[PDB]
Design a protein around this ligand. Structure first.
Ligand SMILES: Nc1ncnc2c1ncn2[C@H]1C[C@H](O)[C@@H](COP(=O)(O)OP(=O)(O)OP(=O)(O)O)O1
Ligand SMILES: [Ca+2]
Ligand SMILES: [Ca+2]
Length: 431
DNA sequence: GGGGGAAGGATTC
DNA sequence: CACGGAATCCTTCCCCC
């Protein structure tokens, strides 16, 4: 059934949307032509110099390899899909998918065999699965089912820190310590009879995958590695409802990534993947022995990242206690080109922004407005201030101008918008 | 020269 | 019958000291 693309492509070609992609895709394909050339003109000598620099560095990274923490990553299974299939049985053995007709968020495994995967227009999906059932999301439910899963994690790490509703990291390195010598009374749980769990990190995670099960009906995969970088990759190795671990010794970390696809990493995306295969980089093992050249093509802050993924290095301290940098609200709709109407919705927006921006009492000193053209061309203007602006009023006050500035710049021709947005940032976060 | 800040990308759930 | 919303981090420039 791999000829899905013959329906996917077949129903995107002309699309206002597709057209825009080409440029996004060309522009990038060129950022590459540039990188390839700028490279080809590097002194076969500079590498000797570079190499030394790099190697030297690594040698040290390697010396401070922190293999003492046992990080765990829990990742729910088709979370939004699952939750709904649970609450409304009539679905159960049918092909569903949370989201709308425009964009789909998750999909149960059965609906996936048709091609329905996250981030795929709703209408498109129904072409691969006419018998589909699209359920509109109710974040108020999920947000809540999550907190029941969290309360369970807590009994394992007070500062668990959660990346999202379906993901979360844990440092069971401490709970592990105080468990080795524990009776069997604190390690048995009732079914619905009992089952008792061991002391290995393998079992501790098995107990968590269990406590959750029997308190939601939902299942989730998990990974266990010395650092958070591998944990995220490891949880998916044996999904759904499963897990995988990488022991603490060096070799494990190495033998693991040895032939691991660079993209798989929780940071390498569509661009970095293409952009890197350009130099022939596919696995971390390859990447590692191109450390010289890399060091002279990607800004410093970057090859640092790559060098890490080469050695199998990740973080080992789940910061915790959300700092928060920005905060926003946006929305797409039907072409709104009418002059007046613009400020109009903008009013409503800023309102919501401040509105939501109140529960937590914060105040930033720079507003950002986002205007998305009818042909998916974005543009974002923002202006800084002296204040700490907070009330719905204060905000619009600025946003209206920035918005105006554009209507003029492109004045006697209307601004055919498809989406608009207002993001507030620059919080003092206490000085 | 260096230290933000604005613009627009890349990434993930 | 027409490709989300929200956060955060990164890549380049241009501007004021
Ligand atoms: N663009 C998106 N918007 C909202 N949610 C998304 C988006 N992309 C993915 N997700 C969510 C929906 C699912 O919970 C999940 C699917 O992506 P995936 O990379 O497989 O994560 P996952 O491993 O946690 O989910 P799964 O158990 O389905 O495999 O992430
Ligand atoms: Ca999930
Ligand atoms: Ca995952």
């Amino acid at each position: 059934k791999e000829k899905i693309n013959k329906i996917i492509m077949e129903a995107t070609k002309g699309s206002r949307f597709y057209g825009n992609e080409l440029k996004k895709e060309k522009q990038v394909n060129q950022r590459i032509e540039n990188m390839m050339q700028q490279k080809a003109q590097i002194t076969s000598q500079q590498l000797r110099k570079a190499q030394l620099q790099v190697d030297r560095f690594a040698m040290e990274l390697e010396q401070s390899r922190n293999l003492s923490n046992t990080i765990v990553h829990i990742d729910m299974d088709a979370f939004y899909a699952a939750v709904e299939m649970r609450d409304n049985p009539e679905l159960k053995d049918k092909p569903i998918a949370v989201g709308s007709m425009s964009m789909l968020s998750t999909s149960n495994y059965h609906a996936r065999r048709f091609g329905v995967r996250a981030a795929m227009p709703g209408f498109i999906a129904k072409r691969l699965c006419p018998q589909l059932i699209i359920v509109p999301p109710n974040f108020d439910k999920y947000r809540a089912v999550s907190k029941e899963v969290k309360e369970i994690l807590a009994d394992y790490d007070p500062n668990f820190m959660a990346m999202s509703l379906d993901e979360a990291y844990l440092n069971i390195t401490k709970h592990l310590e105080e468990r080795q010598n524990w009776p069997e009374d604190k390690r048995r749980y009732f079914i619905k009879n009992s089952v008792v769990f061991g002391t290995s990190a393998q079992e501790v995670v098995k107990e968590i995958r269990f406590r959750i099960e029997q308190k939601t009906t939902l299942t989730a995969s998990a990974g266990i590695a010395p650092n958070t970088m591998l944990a995220k990759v490891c949880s998916d190795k044996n999904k759904p409802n499963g897990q995988y671990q990488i022991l603490p010794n060096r070799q494990a970390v190495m033998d693991f990534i040895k032939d691991l696809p660079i993209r798989k990493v929780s940071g390498i995306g569509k661009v970095t993947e293409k952009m890197l295969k350009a130099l022939g980089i596919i696995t971390c093992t390859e990447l590692y022995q191109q450390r010289a050249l890399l060091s002279l093509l990607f800004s410093e802050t970057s090859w640092h990242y790559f060098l890490h993924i080469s050695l199998g290095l990740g973080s080992t301290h789940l910061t915790r206690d959300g700092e928060r940098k920005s905060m926003s609200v946006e929305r797409t709709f039907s072409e709104i080109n009418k002059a007046e109407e613009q400020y109009s919705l903008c009013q409503e927006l800023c309102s919501e922004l401040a509105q939501d921006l109140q529960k937590e009492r914060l105040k930033g000193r720079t507003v950002t407005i986002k205007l998305k053209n009818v042909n998916f061309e974005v543009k974002t203007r923002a202006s800084t201030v002296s204040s700490v602006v907070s009330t719905a009023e204060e905000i619009f006050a600025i946003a209206k101008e920035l918005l105006k500035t554009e209507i003029d710049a492109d004045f006697p021709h209307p601004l055919r918008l498809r989406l608009m947005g207002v993001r507030i940032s620059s919080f003092p976060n206490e000085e």
